[PDB]
């Protein structure tokens, strides 16, 4: 069910790096429930999930509402890599990252979901 699977040749790495930079700019909603709140409230600019979920059904619900809100989603293959990409000390299973009016981070979100649009 991971048909937007991100490729380990550095697209995963740019995803997790932009996760970390958004974590340092506090633009980051972590975990599946808070990701779901950000997508349902429409604050979300991009959303990554983790395909290393042991039952992946517990994150399969957010591609629905991301298709409804028309925000790009993409899966990285490790919730541990996403977890310390956030800086959490636990495994983050699905992360959402928003934006503001003016930031270089918002530019990096723009180019990043341009690459996600090249996937989907």
């Amino acid at each position: 069910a991971a048909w937007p699977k991100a490729e380990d040749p550095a697209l995963v790495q740019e995803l997790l790096d932009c996760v970390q930079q958004a974590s340092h700019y506090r633009q980051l909603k972590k975990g599946a429930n808070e990701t779901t709140k950000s997508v349902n409230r429409g604050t979300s600019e991009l959303v990554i999930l983790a395909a290393d979920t042991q039952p992946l059904s517990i994150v399969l619900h957010i591609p629905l509402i991301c298709e409804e809100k028309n925000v790009p989603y993409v899966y990285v293959p490790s919730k541990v890599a996403l977890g310390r990409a956030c800086g959490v000390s636990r495994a983050v299973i699905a992360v959402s990252l928003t934006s503001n009016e003016a930031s270089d981070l918002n530019s990096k979100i723009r180019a990043l979901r341009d690459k996600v649009e090249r996937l989907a």
Binding site: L64, E67, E68, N70, P72, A111, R113, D114, E117
Partner: protein, 242 residues
């Protein structure tokens, strides 16, 4: 604000089949419920009898680009009770339910979606309503559902694609009438994320225009969305119904 059980009267809107419900401290755009007693995705709605029967689902510009255009001040929406609408990019059938509430029992909505899960919720909603058809196919392949769609009056377009004008181009070259309606939602961050949004909007208008539409008006959806445009145009004629 719009609490459950507040008295709120309903008057018609300027468009055909669109209603506006004015209350004490607020107003709420709303359509007429085609299948009464049932909310689709869990929305507030309005019941009233003739002087049981009459019911009005409240329609959200934050969950619907078309309600964002109607509250955005759009001249015409091309859709009326009796129309045939080709909806493009139909996730879960929510705005497809509001379009189906506009064109009503005698109308027909032709919902197209690529994803299977929104396909499933679309088959739930489209099993409840009998004027919407479910089509789960690729919008980049109109010859897949050329056995399913006749010549429609309106095309609504909400896809998050970089080749949006080409998809709507070939879909209109197979399914849209001589002098047809087209109503496209555009996301400038989705077409070209490194360009300014007015230039992305004007370039998509130019791609429709050399795709032989005729742009009537453009409005940007910006108390309700950011960097989104709604372009209202008409296929092969300057005036709509022909």
């Amino acid at each position: 604000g719009a609490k459950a059980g507040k008295k709120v009267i309903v008057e018609p809107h300027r468009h055909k089949g669109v209603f506006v419900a004015r209350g004490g401290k607020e107003d709420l755009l709303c359509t007429a419920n085609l299948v009464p007693g049932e909310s689709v995705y869990g929305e507030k709605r309005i019941s009233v009898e003739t002087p049981t029967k009459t019911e009005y689902r409240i329609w959200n510009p934050f969950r619907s680009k078309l309600a964002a255009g109607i509250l955005g001040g759009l001249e015409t929406i091309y859709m009326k009770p009796g129309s045939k609408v080709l909806y493009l990019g139909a996730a879960s059938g929510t705005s497809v339910s509001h379009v189906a509430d506009i064109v009503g029992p005698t109308g027909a909505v032709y919902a197209v979606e690529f994803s299977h899960r929104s396909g499933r919720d679309l088959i739930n909603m489209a099993t409840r309503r009998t004027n919407v058809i479910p089509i789960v196919e690729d919008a980049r392949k109109p010859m897949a559902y050329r056995m399913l769609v006749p010549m429609v009056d309106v095309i609504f377009a909400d896809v998050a694609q970089p080749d949006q004008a080409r998809i709507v181009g070939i879909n209109a070259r197979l399914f849209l009438k001589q002098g047809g309606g087209l109503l496209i939602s555009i996301k400038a961050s989705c077409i070209d994320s490194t360009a300014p949004p007015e230039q992305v909007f004007a370039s998509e208008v130019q791609k429709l225009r050399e795709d032989k539409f005729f742009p009537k008006e453009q409005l940007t959806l910006e108390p309700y969305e950011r960097d989104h445009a709604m372009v209202s145009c008409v296929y092969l004629q300057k005036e709509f119904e022909g």
